[PDB]
């Protein structure tokens, strides 16, 4: 706690009580949140009470380094944490997860693109269940 900013404090707590780094930004928010607005004693208490701790360490096992495959950056991030000696680097392994832009728009995808052509092209044609006299009178261009 005492010589580290509150984010780095959540790192260390994850490392020490679950054996992992912080998996995602939602998790960073929940725990870092609770560390503000309550003690460090609350953070520690939440981890050990949570389900992850319960699933894997149970009541009688000492936690250990998880070395997780799974969420995504978790494996590389955890292993950077495990490799550092005490006081070797104080820097955040994960300051926070940077949010990602969109490479492709919805309309570029083939199935959508096709469905747009079908509605757009032949948007105006002949309507069934409409009496013909009403249909012949209907205007296509409308405004302009």
């Amino acid at each position: 706690h005492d010589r580290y900013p509150n984010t780095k404090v959540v790192e260390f707590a994850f490392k020490h009580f679950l054996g992992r780094a912080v998996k995602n930004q939602a998790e960073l928010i929940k725990y870092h949140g609770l560390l503000g607005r309550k003690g460090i004693k609350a953070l520690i208490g939440a981890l050990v009470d949570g389900e992850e701790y319960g699933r894997l360490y149970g009541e009688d096992t000492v936690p250990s380094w998880q070395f997780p495959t799974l969420p995504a950056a978790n494996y590389p991030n955890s292993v950077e944490l495990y490799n550092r000696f005490t006081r070797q680097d104080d820097s955040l392994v994960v300051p926070s997860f940077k949010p990602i832009r969109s490479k492709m728009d919805i309309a570029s995808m083939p199935l959508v693109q096709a469905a747009l052509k079908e509605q757009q092209a032949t948007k105006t044609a002949l309507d069934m269940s409409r009496p013909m006299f009403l249909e012949l009178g209907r205007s296509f261009k409308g405004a302009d």
Partner: protein, 161 residues
């Protein structure tokens, strides 16, 4: 993650605009495509084991990798590689249903290059495997689904490379 419906919503929300007809049309387009996507997903799930088998046979196995001193040598490593292949397939299926490539970026693509480099896993071989899976998947899903399926596979491949 994000899906096509949510993507439209999010774009409007940043503008602060209420949903408009043009936006509605994009949503409508997605809804029609949906039925096809669901059928494709079911096909992939049922044939997942085979898809992986075929793809491995095409690219991974009978190679230096499987021979001693190769990355896929030893049972442990072999099992890991096929587990990774399964991941890619599952996520691609999720993306196809979603209609958005974002989930791939958020879960699969993020940190993968770095992980692989530390592990010493060969990226090009992995990409080869993904491409192989794509080809097999294209056949099973059928033509309409194929084009949609292919884009997500290509997205994964481009990210890794």
């Amino acid at each position: 993650m994000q899906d096509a419906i949510t993507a439209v919503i999010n774009n409007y929300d940043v503008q602060g605009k209420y949903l408009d007809g043009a936006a509605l049309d994009k949503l409508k387009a997605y809804f029609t495509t949906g039925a096809v996507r669901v059928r494709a997903a079911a096909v992939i799930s049922s044939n997942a084991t085979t898809i992986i088998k075929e793809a491995a046979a095409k690219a991974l196995i009978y190679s230096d990798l499987t021979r001693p001193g190769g990355n896929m040598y030893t049972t442990r490593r072999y099992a890991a590689c096929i587990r990774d292949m399964d991941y890619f397939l599952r996520y691609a299926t999720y993306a196809m249903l979603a209609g958005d490539p974002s989930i791939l970026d958020e879960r699969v693509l993020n940190g993968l290059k770095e992980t692989y480099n530390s592990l010493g896993v060969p990226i090009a071989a992995t990409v080869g495997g993904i491409q192989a899976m794509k080809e097999v998947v294209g056949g099973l899903v059928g033509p309409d689904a194929a084009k949609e399926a292919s884009i997500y596979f290509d997205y994964l491949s481009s990210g890794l490379s």
